UniProtKB/Swiss-Prot annotation, chains A, B:
Native organism: Severe acute respiratory syndrome coronavirus 2
Phenotype upon changing P132H: In strain: Omicron/BA.1, Omicron/BA.2, Omicron/BA.2.12.1, Omicron/BA.2.75, Omicron/BA.4, Omicron/BA.5, Omicron/BQ.1.1, Omicron/XBB.1.5, Omicron/EG.5.1
Native organism taxonomy: Viruses, Riboviria, Orthornavirae, Pisuviricota, Pisoniviricetes
Subunit structure comment from the entry: 3CL-PRO exists as monomer and homodimer. Only the homodimer shows catalytic activity. Interacts with host FBXO22; this interaction promotes the proteasomal degradation of nsp5.
Protein's recorded name: 3C-like proteinase nsp5
Catalytic reaction annotation: TSAVLQ-|-SGFRK-NH2 and SGVTFQ-|-GKFKK the two peptides corresponding to the two self-cleavage sites of the SARS 3C-like proteinase are the two most reactive peptide substrates. The enzyme exhibits a strong preference for substrates containing Gln at P1 position and Leu at P2 position
Record's function text: Cleaves the C-terminus of replicase polyprotein at 11 sites. Recognizes substrates containing the core sequence [ILMVF]-Q-|-[SGACN]. Cleaves and inactivates human TRMT1, preventing tRNA guanine(26)-dimethylation of tRNAs. May cleave human NLRP1 in lung epithelial cells, thereby activating the NLRP1 inflammasome pathway. May cleave human GSDMD, triggering alternative GSDME-mediated epithelial cell death upon activation of the NLRP1 inflammasome, which may enhance the release interleukins 1B, 6, 16 and 18. Also able to bind an ADP-ribose-1''-phosphate (ADRP).
Consequence when changing M49A: Does not affect ability to cleave and inactivate human TRMT1
Localization terms from the record: Host cytoplasm; Host Golgi apparatus; Host nucleus
Length: 304, 304
């Protein structure tokens, strides 16, 4: 028992991290096969960030202007191209530590681990979720750009995020491994405000099932609700609308605990309306929404 | 910016995990050099756990009764010994992935990362702290025994914990890499209740400094306190007494933010007395105590 904000083991992704330097800018790159992926703003000065024409800035850069360093040895860049907001630097050596991998674009509500890096060196690993406003609440400093978000399916690493930017409000923006930003953000130092950060209802429900599985049962009540009834309360609390797909997704957790999905919805409805009353659930004084129903099943069953 | 419960990169420790089987019991082992460390209860049946005489049970076991499997290849056990509550299985091959390492016994309040494993395979990584009652609030299931807790100092892994047991209240108990349990726990299936789980005051103060560093400043007040005055309030809230050593430890965070340690103590004193009033600090509705002052500095400066 016990339920923790758990990240995937990072070793497979640590073996992919490299340092990319272009001129006076140094960020992280992801080395898979003979390609190094990094944010295209590696080609900018802090002044170019204000209004960058990336296609024009890139005309002035050649293969030798990109200094790629894996560990403490230099990689030879034999080609470079821009795919959306990422640069792909073709090197002459295939990464020997390249794991089985995929590039996936995730939906809001989905969770992933992040291996925060500085100068191609991993500093830490943590779990976060793609918010409904397409930002992430990470922990990134200057030099952390190029750090990646991922999920592991036994031996296959599914890369879903590359860190690019920090909005004025401290939240984070980035792209998938094809260079397409999550949400409306652009790689420009311009005022970009995120939209409403709603709560991922399906994830809160999954976390309430993890609490019942791990012995926290105080919040369980004698009521039930309907999808329409629960969604009226959820809207009022800036919770995402719950769909029949989310109910289906919760099916296995509902089977494991014997608590019907709509009964758990009524438990959540009362927690929203009454508050925690100074109580905690899985060591938390707030309703956690960064555990998907798949994460709950994986952690509670011990998938390796 | 952004402040997350961050674990150390786990790759160095993933390369040490092996599966240890003795009879019908299978748990995890830590392979460093030509030695495999694992909990001594690998030699017990679920019935032996009730009242085990380990020295007697071990008489019946030979080198060939310990099946050590690294990845999918078997290791040859050429010796075995019991050190306190751990078994050291000498193998004929030195682990090629053995990192630079140390065995350290940590004090309560200290934090470390845990790489949870099942059948020698890493399933996840998370951060936790040695509680003042010498338990940890981990996430471990049946088969997770032998999973280790560690800290990294650049390239040196300091192993501080091996998981052994789950108390009836869901909390966790284990030993250091010398086999000595943290606290009073014994490797017996007997009623063992943990003592008071007090809050690690120095860690809460360090986390309040991380909040000010990352822009959460609402809780800052116009008051100051003394060590004696703050400790009267802290005792009443089951907070650990704050010492001049803890004040000295906070010195650098105090310098970075310009907020005197005793001023932050008064901020904490008011949060304890008034509550959060439905507000959050670093995305938390409760005062987090599993970040040491060293963790705050490391994460906020990006030590790799
Ligand atoms: C500067 N900085 C501090 N903590 C950060 C965490 N993550 C990222 C950054 N970096 C940025 O956001 C830079 C700074 C200049 O403005 C822009 C504009 C667009 C883009 Cl794509 C990147 C950036 C951080
Ligand atoms: C059974 N189990 C379930 N979730 C666990 C998480 N961590 C550990 C265990 N295992 C144990 O605690 C076993 C079960 C039998 O009782 C004892 C007694 C002493 C010792 Cl050292 C180990 C154990 C877990
Ligand atoms: Cl910006
Ligand atoms: Cl027990």
């Amino acid at each position: 028992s016990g339920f923790r904000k758990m990240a995937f083991p990072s070793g497979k992704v640590e073996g992919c991290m490299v340092q990319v330097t272009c001129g006076t800018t140094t960020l992280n790159g992801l080395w898979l096969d003979d390609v190094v992926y990094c944010p295209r703003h590696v080609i900018c000065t802090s002044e170019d960030m204000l209004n960058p024409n990336y296609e024009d800035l890139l005309i002035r850069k050649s293969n030798h202007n990109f200094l790629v360093q894996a560990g403490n040895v230099q990689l030879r860049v034999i080609g470079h191209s821009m795919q959306n907001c990422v640069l792909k630097l073709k090197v002459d050596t295939a990464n020997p530590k390249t794991p089985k991998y995929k590039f996936v674009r995730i939906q809001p509500g989905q969770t992933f681990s992040v291996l925060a890096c500085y100068n191609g060196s991993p500093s830490g690993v943590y779990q976060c979720a793609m918010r409904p406003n397409f930002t992430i609440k990470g922990s990134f400093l200057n030099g952390s750009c190029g750090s990646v978000g991922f999920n592991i399916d036994y031996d296959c690493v599914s890369f879903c995020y590359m860190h690019h930017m920090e909005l004025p409000t401290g939240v984070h923006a980035g792209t998938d491994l094809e260079g397409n930003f999550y949400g409306p953000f652009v790689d420009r130092q311009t005022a970009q405000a995120a939209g409403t950060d709603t709560t991922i209802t399906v994830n809160v429900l999954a976390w309430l099932y993890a609490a019942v599985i791990n012995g926290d049962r105080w919040f369980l009540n004698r009521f039930t609700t309907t999808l329409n009834d629960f969604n009226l309360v959820a809207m009022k609390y800036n919770y995402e609308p719950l769909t029949q797909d989310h109910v289906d997704i919760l099916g296995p957790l509902s089977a494991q605990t014997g608590i019907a999905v709509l009964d758990m919805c009524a438990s959540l409805k009362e927690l929203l309306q009454n508050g925690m009353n100074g109580r905690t659930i899985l060591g938390s004084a707030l309703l956690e929404d960064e555990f998907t129903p798949f994460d709950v099943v994986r952690q509670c069953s011990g998938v390796t």
